[PDB]
Amino acid sequence: AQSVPYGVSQIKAPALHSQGYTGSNVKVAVIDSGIDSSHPDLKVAGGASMVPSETNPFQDNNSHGTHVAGTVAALNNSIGVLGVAPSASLYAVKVLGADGSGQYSWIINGIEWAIANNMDVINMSLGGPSGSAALKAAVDKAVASGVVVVAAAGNEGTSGSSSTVGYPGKYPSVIAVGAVDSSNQRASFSSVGPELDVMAPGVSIQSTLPGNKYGAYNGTSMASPHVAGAAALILSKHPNWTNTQVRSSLENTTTKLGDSFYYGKGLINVQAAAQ
Amino acid sequence: AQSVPYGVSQIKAPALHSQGYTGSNVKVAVIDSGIDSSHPDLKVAGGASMVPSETNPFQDNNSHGTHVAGTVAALNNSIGVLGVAPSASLYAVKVLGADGSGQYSWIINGIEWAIANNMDVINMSLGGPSGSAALKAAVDKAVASGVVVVAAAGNEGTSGSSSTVGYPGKYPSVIAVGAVDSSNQRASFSSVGPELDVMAPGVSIQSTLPGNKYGAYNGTSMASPHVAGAAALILSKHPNWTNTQVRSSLENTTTKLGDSFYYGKGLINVQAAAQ
Amino acid sequence: YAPSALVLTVGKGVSATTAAPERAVTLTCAPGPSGTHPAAGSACADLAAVGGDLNALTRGEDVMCPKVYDPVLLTVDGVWQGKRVSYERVFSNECEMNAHGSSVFAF
């Protein structure tokens, strides 16, 4: 038996899948720790590693990347869970090492691979507190090239009234995602600031783990791939909407929550975005 | 110039010295860390060490023993301080090592030397929380042999309403000394219990230190030698009073202070004891 | 003679203990670097830098971590140049913890 994680439902993905919109022919690059291509509930199309000492994109020594991949596209079968865009082509772009750390340039290089292999959507569930020129150039170039770019907002909760949104999420060209619970309540840990764009389910999110396993994680890391999967669904309905139209759609059709400092525009609703 | 520590005066020793009673021809064994025979304000007659690895009684590597010796008999000259019994013959019986620790049997052996060399008064400013058969036998034998035995009560302040008097002070055959300040106030640290006998000055007591020096110390350790010096004065007035008569005298002529649990019989007054 | 000796502990959780210590090291900088620290010379080197002041140990600039929320409690107890130390801090995950010193948390 296959279960449907609550997050998939909260954002109205099943409504679209029922009308035949599953993410088909859309290329999503999960920029992260690798994806276990050997997992039963996943189908990884290809990928590459920017991590010098770990050069197999299909070996996830950290487990993070496998969990994120599953929220985007866990297969639609009679086992496991169900991703937002179960037919999306999934690319493993490995930029984080077994301990989860990646150098900026690994990240940047990964985005660069993402651009040149014609990815449609990039998911980056990673962040650091400083920005950089090369980093900004690279995310901005992705957006110019027409890729949808989504990133986790960060996990530094709130702090006075200063922004706690990290990079790359902090950049205007990127969709930055905060996390709510099944109650549409902001997770206490979710970063705040005027740079946050939208919210998604990020509290005990069930997904795939390496070794044919399943589990639940918390983090704006788990909210991101929901938006990334959401973006893939709309491109599967409307293959020649621009990244700009997809973004706009996601942003204008949200369910509003609290003030925008803690909630951006609110919870995405892919059925509504897809019109 | 010679100064007179306040403790010497508090107990009325100067009254006796003025009538010619200075402790002369009385043998006092300071059972302790050794005495610096080289100090100017002291005259050490002899002694021995029960400390296997430190066999010179006249070398005080801890300084304690030198300070105690000076409260008993610092010389009466125009330099330094002034002991209670400035003409007493002083014996260094070394039973404590440089770090101040001594084994029970060292102690016991020292008392045994004290008995066989005909000491009149023994001062022990040392203590430990357990008693022992050999230890009790040895202090009891000293008293049978006619030696006055004085010991510091201990420094474990008060504790509920249980006795904090250590050994050898805890034994009935021994005079146990607690410490008062120049105000006849019990020092907060002074041990309590029904085994305490009398009080003496034990708060910042000036005395001799090795290396021709002087300083002030706190402890029931500093109160003891005041009683020991007191005992030597009476024997110098009354050379064939028994240890029993000397004790009795000290005990019956005290200035009463608080309840006897914290003050024994109170502050000794050697002028009064000497009749 | 530098009175210098520290112990560091780490475990999943948000407070001292309701956060069982899962790893614990000791570090000594005085006279020379030692202890059970897979990077003694540096952590020492590290503290020297900042003058043994936990609270001034710049993060990364250069490293990205996963945005999983799986908090880690780090504890430092001891003395530095004979000044007593008792620091505590929860990092949102362990990567965060590690991207923090350079080497103190090089564990």
Add this chain to the structure above:
Amino acid sequence: YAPSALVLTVGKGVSATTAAPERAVTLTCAPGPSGTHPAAGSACADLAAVGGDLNALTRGEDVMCPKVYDPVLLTVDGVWQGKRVSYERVFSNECEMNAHGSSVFAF
């Protein structure tokens, strides 16, 4: 894997600090005894005995100390069998402190 690591400090005084740390050692019992402790194997041996319980370390029976009052503050911070430890105790002088363990305070 025994999460075991301690730091001991001592200085003249009656409280944590208004009692500057004058000597500081580290001890590790797991896996094997080490640290800056002039008697690691034993102190370890010691704790094992009592099962790392400061508060149950019998004094002497056998040793006399001077009855000088010159208090010493001893501090123990760390983990023992992965249980957090933070002990403190004022002994009336250092001899007293030392006559206490057998070897923990073998410093």
